[PDB]
């Protein structure tokens, strides 16, 4: 019953989440390389995070008889300016995500693939949380700025961020 | 002391009771085609519970001492344009089945058959929540429309009909 | 990735099944005749559960992407020579669904549909179990023979079945 | 608000259940005399039932204003050829006060006392289970014939039955 | 379906059992003025019981597919001269009431509103227990007379019903 | 002790709590008629909660000593443009008898009759409710306006009110 349009485009989601995972995980290398080990954490629990929202979308893909295929996966930026200039490519390439489900939602509203559109709904109550815990940092990152005292004390707070 | 003719003009709503069952378990297979769970459930609890009116009267009969005989079902309608229009189906059927029941009803008086009277009178009352229950439903839909979110939103409504 | 040829193959199960339970409500009818109280609550009970067995697979081919349309259901034998003549009816027809079952299951391997498969394996042993639930009575109403008091011993082991 | 001629058509069917039940109880004693405990459980259980049927008719006319005056007694049979023959006459009887109160149910449409009609269903609608009770066992001594084996039972099986 | 007829025959027995709950609650303002709690306290959960009677019906006019339609309730009673004068226009009014009842419950079988005419075999029964209540109190007052011991007796007595 | 005055003030706000739960029975008729289940349950729990202002007040001027006269009530509107101005006339219309209330409070504070100020400080902080609880929903259904779907979810959420 499923379409074969859906299939491909959930098909280009999972792919694309992979891809979101691997960046953070980039992430974490260069936070790793910076010496910042909260932020490290907060990075590889995002990986992780990401990886499972791509693995209930693998699943549901399987369960509705669809097959789902892997095409290859990018190389992510190895390098940043500073703490603050990447978490502005999280809140941007969040941003984008943000979108590229918003477009899900409509397809499978077009088609009348009701069971889909439920499904996806998990993702458009997900990601407000994914956008607005970046800007949360970036606000943050900004107003603290150059001094590294107050960096290091947002450094231990997402030491403790966890699942 | 119960007549031949009672006898026969129930078998026939018997016979005629576990259609309007079978009719509504073809509208939850339809239901799950264009994906709507809480639409089919719906459609299961009132199979099973029509399928309960024709023991009802099934053990009725015994009781009463006439023989019951069943008839082959007939292949029931497998498609319908719009959830809207499948309930306006249902309505109209039901409000059909009202009128055979107050039919045996008065056949019951004109037999002076007291005993089958007041067995009736149940599914007299029954009947004002069938059709209404049903209508209410009809209604709901025509002012929701194409508006598909508000579908679901009733889908789960139905979704909650327990026996 | 359930092929069309098991969906058909399913659905006329399905029908069958529920002929297997329009058949017993039929005996329930014989039995209620000639007042044989617990043999008609046998049948009643078999009606019900025969019925749930053609639900079960409603919802797997359901949940599996296929599409269920319900045939026309014949007319069931009403009237049997005796308890015995009707239990050996019993047993035969459920010789004839064990094997219907039989040429389901080689279907789904030659479709190397595994998931069906081993959906299937409960009907199987299932039917061992009313192969042999018929043929532990068939034996015990010859042996008893036309005893009338064995007769009316074994209605009254009847009339304590549940599921 | 009641009419005399209701009072008056009312105490004879109180009277005629406290005869129903003295006959009920005069074959228990019957019963009793043939070495039967099961059917003197049956009879003696019938005649506490039909005995509050009355008392229900009693406090119904004394809600309605009217006076309760009680008439003689008729000896009821004492003696009856079998359990067979003992039974057929409770058929007979339980089908003429059903009879009795279907005259009654129409004097109370005449008179427009709806009052009188609507708490009579309950004796229209439970005199059913008094002739099918009844007959149900007459039509099982029948198929016993001469096989005491299965007339004690029978009797057992009778003992069961409470309040 | 339902007819027109029906529609507007019951939202006068809906307002008719507003009338009815009104009046009861008026009749226990009087009663509590003459130092009776038991009386008044009787006529406060009657008050609820034919309001209930009223809203049942309103249900099932709504269910049946019928617009529902509220006139304005009249000034009821006052006062009486004693205690069996007030219950002597109970017995009496609930007799009307019954009387208005029985007008449809023929009018539906007219109608061949065999719908109709089940739901309202309830308030056949019904009517049946006030009418013995309230002469099963009428006739108390009678046999009291002026004992106005008796008469507190059967205060407490009715002191002890509740609504529910 | 309690005056003249005050009594003949009470009986007033009495008479008019009164017509404010015959109002709202209305509003429930009205919201019946266009197939609103949730809304008609709010108006109905509001007609019996005011009912219950009522008879607070009723028991209070009886304990004080003071009569009960209770005039006729006037017909309420039974017809309205849409669920916002139901809800525009109820908001209006608590802020009427809120100031009205007002008026009381003063009535008590001038005359020295403090047992009755005390008492009506209940209706003071209620009546904040009274008019927040319909003024937090006059500016929902601005907000959602036409959009049928909203209507039906804001619907909904009435449903579930209780006392
Ligand atoms: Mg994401």
Redesign the interface.
Known sequence: ??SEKMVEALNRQINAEIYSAYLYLSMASYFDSIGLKGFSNWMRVQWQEELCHAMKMFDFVSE??GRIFLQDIKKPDSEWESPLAAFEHVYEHEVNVTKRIHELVEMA?QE????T??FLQWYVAEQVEEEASALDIVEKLRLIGEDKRALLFLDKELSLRQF
Chains 1, 2, 3, 4, 6 share one sequence.
């Open positions: 019953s499923i509705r008889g509203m009348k693939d009701f069971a559109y439920n």
